[PDB]
Amino acid sequence: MARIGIHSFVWSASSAQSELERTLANTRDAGFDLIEFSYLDPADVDIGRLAKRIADLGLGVAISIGLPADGDISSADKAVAARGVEILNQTIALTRDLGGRKVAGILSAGHGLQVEAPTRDQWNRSAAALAKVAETAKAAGVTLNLEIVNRFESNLLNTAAQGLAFIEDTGSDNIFLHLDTFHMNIEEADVGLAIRHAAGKIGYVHIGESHRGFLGTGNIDFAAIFDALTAIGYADDLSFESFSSEIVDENLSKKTAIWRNLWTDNMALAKHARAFIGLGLETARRKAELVSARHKP
Amino acid sequence: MARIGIHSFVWSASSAQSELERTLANTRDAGFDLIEFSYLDPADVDIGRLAKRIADLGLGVAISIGLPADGDISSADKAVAARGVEILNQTIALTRDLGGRKVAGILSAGHGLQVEAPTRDQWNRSAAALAKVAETAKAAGVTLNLEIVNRFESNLLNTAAQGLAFIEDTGSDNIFLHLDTFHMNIEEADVGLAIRHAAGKIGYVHIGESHRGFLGTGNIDFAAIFDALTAIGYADDLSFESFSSEIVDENLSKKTAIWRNLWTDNMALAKHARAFIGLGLETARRKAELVSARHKP
Amino acid sequence: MARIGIHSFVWSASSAQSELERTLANTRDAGFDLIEFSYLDPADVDIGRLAKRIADLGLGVAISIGLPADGDISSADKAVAARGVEILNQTIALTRDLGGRKVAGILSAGHGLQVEAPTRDQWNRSAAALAKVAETAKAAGVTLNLEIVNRFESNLLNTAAQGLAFIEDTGSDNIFLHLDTFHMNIEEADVGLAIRHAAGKIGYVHIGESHRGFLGTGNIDFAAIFDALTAIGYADDLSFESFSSEIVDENLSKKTAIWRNLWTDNMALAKHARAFIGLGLETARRKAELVSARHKP
Amino acid sequence: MARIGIHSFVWSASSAQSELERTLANTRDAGFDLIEFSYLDPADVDIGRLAKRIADLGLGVAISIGLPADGDISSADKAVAARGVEILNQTIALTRDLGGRKVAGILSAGHGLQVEAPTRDQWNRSAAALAKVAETAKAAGVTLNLEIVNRFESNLLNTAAQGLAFIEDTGSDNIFLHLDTFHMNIEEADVGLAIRHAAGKIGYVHIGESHRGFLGTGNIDFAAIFDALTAIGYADDLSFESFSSEIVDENLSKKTAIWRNLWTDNMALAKHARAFIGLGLETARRKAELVSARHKP
Ligand SMILES: [Mn+2]
Ligand SMILES: [Mn+2]
Ligand SMILES: [Mn+2]
Ligand SMILES: [Mn+2]
């Protein structure tokens, strides 16, 4: 049921049909059930073909993006906000046609370091806009999942609590939270506590280390995270995330400030990630079983 | 508002009026507002006096004992068992007369390293007995609080979960858990998870480090403990325990195996522990409020 | 003879003499005994008066800045680099005249998100230039401590090991490391490991929580940090750092992306930070001694 | 070369020949490279047949005991002490006959809950005694490895620091520390700190969880442990150890106080442990490597 996926960009930024094969094959060989893509051009990509290959391998697909400056759905500039809505519509169309059920990533504002404090108007404009978009998405068989990111990557929703308040403000029953452990460790008071507080409104989870390298080679208490996810009975998808300057686009390198590369071999990276996640989850499950064991003699 | 207690044996073993006075004074000068007594001589100690001396000082009181071998209410020997009930009934009365509302400690079995594995009949025997002792305690306006201890100190209730199931077996509505962080860290799958699991059934709490010295100088995750307590909204008394063999009776000193002394200055020990617990709970409270902060612009 | 400090901007961002006065009195009431100032204009401020008021209170002083994009000493454009050196030289004379021993902060490159990936020539330029400014600093009786910051605030020195290498390249013995727990938790593989790796090259430390709010209210493992400092016998100054949109000036709020404020009462915040760092170090002192205890009978 | 090994009590509580040989097979199936026979009676054991299957299975071997009360080498009573020498001589022999390199377990004093606080005489006696036995073991090409245990399992050596001092007192170069994370978590101030303090003198390591069941299902910071071991360049044997009421003795089981059914499926247990240790160590290695990466552009 629950899929454990990986971000395509671990493998390749290239949207060439040949590079897409290697991405999908690597994903499968590394041990994952799901691929997350962040860019696809129908013009260059045969979406219909791509959709069938993803099914043929037994993989699931998710689509996540990050709104560009000129596509900021929360902008007072009405033309900018409209391109934001247009991108989201295109992204939903793509996700539906591709076989996926989730649209994820930074959907509420532009992705990047803003040069101005947020305002209530921004918050409300974004909320009213996502209210409507989420309808489009439902009609398409797709959920919206707002990614909560750190202060340097958006000025709006930084916290699960912020996310929850926003979602209420939307009024939608088709908007959920996309939580990322790399972002949570910067912004949340406890990562485990955030997850618990967000129970039932979590639609998608990124697993990324404090520095975005190998899982377990950083500062994040992953046992604490796997315990919380187990406590709440999270049974939806989760995806590994790590990036290299050598692989990702330089729009993204300059934006997520990847100045140094923490690994050179992505198959080793992904393979480790998959054993780390797999075993972390198993342990957490066994531990939850043990807590409640009566141990009557 | 609930009391932050200390155990007397931190101060001395002696029950002599002159020591009783020092014990209470030191307790206050350390910042604590509850005193825990384990031994109180039936013949040598004025109860109604002590009961007055306690309230005068703005101190709460609790009584904890560890059932001796020859008094194990779980023993098949109806005489040895009977000795246990009298020990209990006498401890209930001393508690009531002292102005305290909880009896605690190892109440369900002998305090010590048992020689045989636990049995189903041993279990039922203790529950059947404690069931009836509980109604006595009720009539006295006192509560029973079963300490859950490590494998070496009882063979019967080592875990919060088995402690929870035992209480279901008694059918009593006046029995609760006494959890101790030193024991919990040995037996529980996850101290915080065990606390969450027992919520609403915890009547008393013992704060003690992994090695039984200064708080924060061992291996226990006290932040996680405070977070859990905060999460389940615990509002009942708790006390610090930490033992020196130069201070405590050679009986308990052999029963809990104090071979080393981790401290010489118990005022510095107690002042440190008070600051540790106070700041700890404050910090966990601010953290739980922060988790839920809508940070709406 | 180490000081426990606090950054002025916890109190006020203003240079008015009445506000500078308040900053100082607040520092003392909170229990700190150093003050860190970000920058003060000599024509705007009665410097000698300030220095005399600092010494009268019994406070020490450090100055930290972050080079402007306008003044980046790593820049190829010489004019920009020269503006850097001149800002550096002025900051030194400020520290010296105020009766301080440390110039800290981002001293190696522009403070902010960079649009270019780092280069070796950028590295060498900064090294070459700082090698010289260190001599100026020595003559003035002051050390240069290079702040190591997260990817979003500089593109050059993000890691304690990067700093070590960088320092190595400067050939200087008046350039040390300025480590910041908030930055370390994002970039380092292990905060404690990184501290241990940097032994005898650490000139200054910022204590700040993962979200930059109240200490212990985030994800940073501070016990591990106090243990590492203690393992290396760190005997120099460290300061508490937390900021509020309400108090800082729009330049800093925007560069460090303070979108939401985690506290409102900065006296409570400071007193708390004082107890937390105070206790934290005492506890780490207690424990590192326990480790070694022979405990022979 | 070093091996990741396993304690026989995962598999069997028996010294019957077929059981011993099952043990070997189960060890190899679980991915382990060493077997440790604990509390083995060599009477009625075909050493040659056993040593043959070890070779076929590609296994290392170690022998671990805990001295009985009437074999306590630290006793004043000379008859009791001479018997403990004879037990040790016998177990040295069996180790050599089986192709082992290590004698291990509670070799310094009686394995159990002493009713006596330790004395300098006991210390000195045991030390002088073991200094001789060490020479015996050297001649047989075998190292001695003192297991440091918790307060309820010996009264002499509970702490790595004590053990370290003890080995100073024996004058030997053939006695080493055998540390156990289960005991360390109860006794040590900090497990990593203890491991770093004992560096160079660590001969053998047990990996066991707080409650002695599944690795990671209890309270122990295993990351910290694998980190410390990595930092000191530990390059000797370590072994998984776990107890459940399913497999029990009437000797070791009684001493270790095992009352609870933490597992029934010892092959799942072992394969999880094997993956845990395996992955934990790779993760530790990658992390330490990362700490000192220069990341110069
Ligand atoms: Mn993400
Ligand atoms: Mn207790
Ligand atoms: Mn800083
Ligand atoms: Mn062991």
UniProtKB/TrEMBL annotation, chains A, B, C, D:
SUPFAM superfamilies from the xrefs? Answer: Xylose isomerase-like
Question: What are the Xylose isomerase-like TIM barrel domain coordinates in residue numbering?
Answer: 25-249
Sorted UniProt keywords: Metal-binding
What molecular functions are annotated in GO for this chain?
metal ion binding
The residues listed in the UniProt record as binding Mn(2+), with positions renumbered to this chain, are 147, 180, 206, 241
Give the superkingdom in one word. Bacteria
Q: Can you name this protein?
A: L-ribulose 3-epimerase
| Keyword Metal-binding set for record | yes
Q: Which InterPro entries match?
A: IolE/XylAMocC-like (IPR050312), Xyl_isomerase-like_sf (IPR036237), Xyl_isomerase-like_TIM-brl (IPR013022)
Q: Species name for this entry?
A: Rhizobium loti
Has UniProt tagged this entry with the keyword Metal-binding? yes
Coiled-coil region(s) at which residues?
none
